[PDB]
UniProtKB/Swiss-Prot annotation:
<feature type="binding site">
    <location>
        <position position="330"/>
    </location>
    <ligand>
        <name>CoA</name>
    </ligand>
</feature>
<keyword id="KW-0436">Ligase</keyword>
<dbReference type="GO" id="GO:0016208">
    <property type="term" value="F:AMP binding"/>
</dbReference>
<feature type="binding site">
    <location>
        <position position="306"/>
    </location>
    <ligand>
        <name>CoA</name>
    </ligand>
</feature>
<dbReference type="InterPro" id="IPR032387">
    <property type="entry name" value="ACAS_N"/>
</dbReference>
<feature type="binding site">
    <location>
        <position position="518"/>
    </location>
    <ligand>
        <name>CoA</name>
    </ligand>
</feature>
<feature type="binding site">
    <location>
        <position position="579"/>
    </location>
    <ligand>
        <name>CoA</name>
    </ligand>
</feature>
<keyword id="KW-0479">Metal-binding</keyword>
<feature type="site" description="Hinge residue important for conformational flexibility">
    <location>
        <position position="512"/>
    </location>
</feature>
<dbReference type="InterPro" id="IPR000873">
    <property type="entry name" value="AMP-dep_synth/lig_dom"/>
</dbReference>
<dbReference type="InterPro" id="IPR042099">
    <property type="entry name" value="ANL_N_sf"/>
</dbReference>
<feature type="binding site">
    <location>
        <begin position="406"/>
        <end position="411"/>
    </location>
    <ligand>
        <name>ATP</name>
    </ligand>
</feature>
<dbReference type="Pfam" id="PF00501">
    <property type="entry name" value="AMP-binding"/>
</dbReference>
<comment type="function">
    <text>Enables the cell to use acetate during aerobic growth to generate energy via the TCA cycle, and biosynthetic compounds via the glyoxylate shunt. Acetylates CheY, the response regulator involved in flagellar movement and chemotaxis.</text>
</comment>
<dbReference type="InterPro" id="IPR020845">
    <property type="entry name" value="AMP-binding_CS"/>
</dbReference>
<feature type="binding site">
    <location>
        <position position="537"/>
    </location>
    <ligand>
        <name>Mg(2+)</name>
    </ligand>
</feature>
<feature type="modified residue" description="N6-acetyllysine; by Pat">
    <location>
        <position position="604"/>
    </location>
</feature>
Length: 634
């Protein structure tokens, strides 16, 4: 156990007693609790209703603050202007540290109004989907907030997706517009963003895209399509800086994020406005102990939900200064992350176990010539953190003075679900600890029976909370199928967890067929598809194996079409194929050439033995197992 340090005790917004009192009210009386807590936002017309939700088959319906109206952008910008207009809303640090920016709330608001008008002039309307395929530059934020201001529904696509992966997202969502940049700048190198867009839009099934707006980030030679392609600067300069935000309903859709699942291709996890923003704002405030003047840095990409809730929306609703970093924590040197901390006097740092492990492998090279004294709070997200990593992070980065908040949540959950509160809860290395206000977790066996006491099982949430995803885009029936059918009347997270004698949770990872690779959520089925699309590949089974930096690696058992021979040319080729289908993020670390896939007489693939064998673990046609072991050895 780590005791709460005096300095945090002295300033904390929530102490142990307040966590107990608030947690208990949040469950016993959600309506008074979230009715009061909803006031963290400005409302145009006030809500009367608060909680109005159901996990019942086939009547899954999630509504929060439903008769209320509000604007996300007014809450994240306009309302801070009068008294804090001059406050820095975003600190931008470039890949190249010679390049930085302090954007004030007033500056940010002005550009958001301009871009809101640019979108409106382009014919974009409330409800339209807007694809954003951007690097980590302040214009992505501007684009996201402008979509929100006018009630367009934005769909941010992570910069590292391949042209094929971008096309799929645009096709599913029917995006009317793509907003991108000429190139991205990362670790001295360029991502060819706009080129990738070009390639995407050549897909014949892409039919909805009217225009591409392009930010001139590097000024590289790019192909231009006259009429379709527009420059960011050209358009924004033309636009009025004046814009009045109209009222959106609490349940007006806000964004879609394509998210990997146990079966099929990624689906558009849908979030609405009111409950989402309230949940984002509240979790940020309390979990990071946010006080005016705290300089906050979340290291997550804007193309993931952590970048949505905890780089942008939570921070800006609360009036915080939030830092956006264009680069990677270990470039030019492993000390970079701490140089950024030092340079911008970061007080709250929130990052990924994959990063921590990466800096850890380098030792004191990660902290060398740095100070780190400005830091008060650390945070970790996206994957289980091993105690040793947690210890190194606490000791080396936080100098043994900083609570570490290990925040468990998901894209589908909008905000933090199980998390320490730095002034309320005593820490255990590797534990996400206790549930947040409004959150009712439970552990059930594979049959659905609640497990009591210290125990493990399938992690479910037994009632709704405000930040919960409301649906899957254009497919509410699959939303129910996916999350509310395995354990009736419950939200199934897809994770396993254990609870200890203290009521602390230890999240042990996906129990479905979803991987965590360098903190990216990937379905095994989608990699298998990408593999099988290759004209030389008959059959593939993909499993995860432990990995000291990535957490899990992708290990692919591959069966070639009859008459095909493996080679070293083919190994790299197949890898490059998956990188083309999805992105570098999905490239398999290992390709296991085999004709010995273990199938039931019924045709089922024995995926448990594959998993065990792939992990260096040595104890219809039974003799395939033995052939698989030899092949592994070789
Ligand atoms: C939260 C931002 C990432 O959102 P995604 O929707 O991409 O991933 C959610 C999944 O990431 C893992 N995960 C996330 N945080 C933790 C965590 N703190 N501990 C263990 N596993 C975690 C859990 O397996 C979960 O089902």
């Amino acid at each position: 156990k780590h005791a709460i340090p005096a300095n945090i005790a002295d300033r904390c917004l929530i102490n142990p007693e307040q966590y107990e009192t608030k947690y208990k009210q949040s469950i016993n009386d959600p309506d008074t609790f979230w009715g009061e807590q909803g006031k963290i936002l400005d409302w145009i017309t006030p809500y009367q209703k608060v909680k109005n939700t159901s996990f019942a088959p086939g009547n899954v319906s999630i509504k929060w603050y439903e008769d209320g109206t509000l604007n996300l952008a007014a809450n994240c910008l306009d309302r801070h202007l009068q008294e804090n207009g001059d406050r820095t809303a975003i600190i931008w640090e470039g890949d190249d540290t010679s390049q930085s920016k302090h954007i004030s709330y007033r500056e940010l608001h002005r550009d958001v109004c301009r871009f809101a008008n640019t979108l409106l002039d382009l014919g974009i309307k409330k409800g339209d989907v807007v694809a954003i395929y951007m690097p980590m530059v302040p214009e992505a934020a501007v684009a996201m907030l402008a979509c929100a201001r006018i009630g367009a529904v934005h769909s941010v696509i992570f910069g590292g997706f391949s042209p094929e992966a971008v096309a799929g997202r645009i096709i599913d969502s029917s995006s009317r517009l793509v907003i991108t940049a000429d190139e991205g700048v990362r670790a001295g190198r360029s991502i060819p963003l706009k080129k990738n867009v070009d390639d995407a839009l050549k897909n014949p099934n892409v039919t909805s895209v009217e225009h591409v707006i392009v930010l001139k980030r590097t000024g590289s030679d790019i192909d231009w399509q006259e009429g379709r392609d527009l420059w960011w600067r050209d358009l924004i300069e033309k636009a009025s800086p004046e814009h009045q935000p109209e009222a959106m309903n609490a349940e007006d859709p806000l964004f879609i994020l394509y998210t990997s699942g146990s079966t099929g291709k990624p689906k558009g996890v849908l979030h609405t406005t009111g409950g989402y923003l309230v949940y984002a704002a509240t979790t940020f405030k309390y979990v990071f102990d946010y006080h005016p003047g705290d300089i906050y840095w979340c290291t997550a990409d804007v193309g993931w939900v952590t970048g949505h809730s905890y780089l942008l929306y939570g921070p800006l609703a609360c009036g915080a200064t939030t830092l956006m970093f264009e680069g990677v924590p270990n470039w030019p040197t492993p000390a970079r992350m701490c140089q950024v901390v030092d340079k911008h006097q970061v007080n709250i740092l929130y990052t990924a176990p994959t990063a921590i492990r990466a800096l850890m492998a380098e030792g004191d090279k990660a902290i060398e010539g740095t100070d780190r004294s400005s830091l008060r709070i650390l945070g970790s997200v996206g994957e289980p953190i091993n105690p040793e990593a947690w210890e190194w992070y606490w000791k080396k980065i936080g100098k043994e003075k900083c609570p570490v908040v290990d925040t468990w949540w998901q894209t589908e959950t909008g905000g933090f679900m199980i998390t320490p509160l730095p002034g309320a809860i005593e820490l255990k290395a590797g534990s996400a600890t206790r549930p947040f206000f409004g959150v009712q977790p439970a552990l059930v066996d594979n049959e659905g029976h609640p497990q009591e006491g210290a125990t493990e099982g399938n992690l479910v949430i037994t009632d709704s909370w405000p930040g919960q995803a409301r649906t899957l885009f254009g497919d509410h029936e699959r939303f129910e199928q996916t999350y509310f059918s395995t354990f009736k009347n419950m939200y199934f997270s897809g994770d396993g967890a254990r609870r200890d004698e203290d009521g602390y949770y230890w999240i042990t990872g996906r129990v479905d067929d979803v991987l965590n690779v360098s903190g990216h959520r990937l379905g095994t089925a989608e990699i298998e598809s990408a593999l099988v699309a290759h004209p030389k590949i008959a059959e593939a089974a993909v499993v995860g194996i432990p990995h000291a930096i990535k957490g899990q690696a992708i290990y692919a058992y591959v069966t070639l079409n009859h008459g095909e021979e493996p080679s070293p040319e083919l190994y790299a080729e197949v890898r490059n194929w998956v990188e083309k289908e999805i992105g570098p993020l999905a490239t398999p670390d290992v390709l296991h050439w085999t004709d010995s896939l273990p199938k039931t007489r019924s045709g089922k693939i024995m995926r448990r033995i594959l998993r065990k064998i792939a992990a260096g673990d040595t104890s219809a046609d039974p003799g395939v197992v033995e052939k698989l072991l030899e092949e592994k050895q070789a």
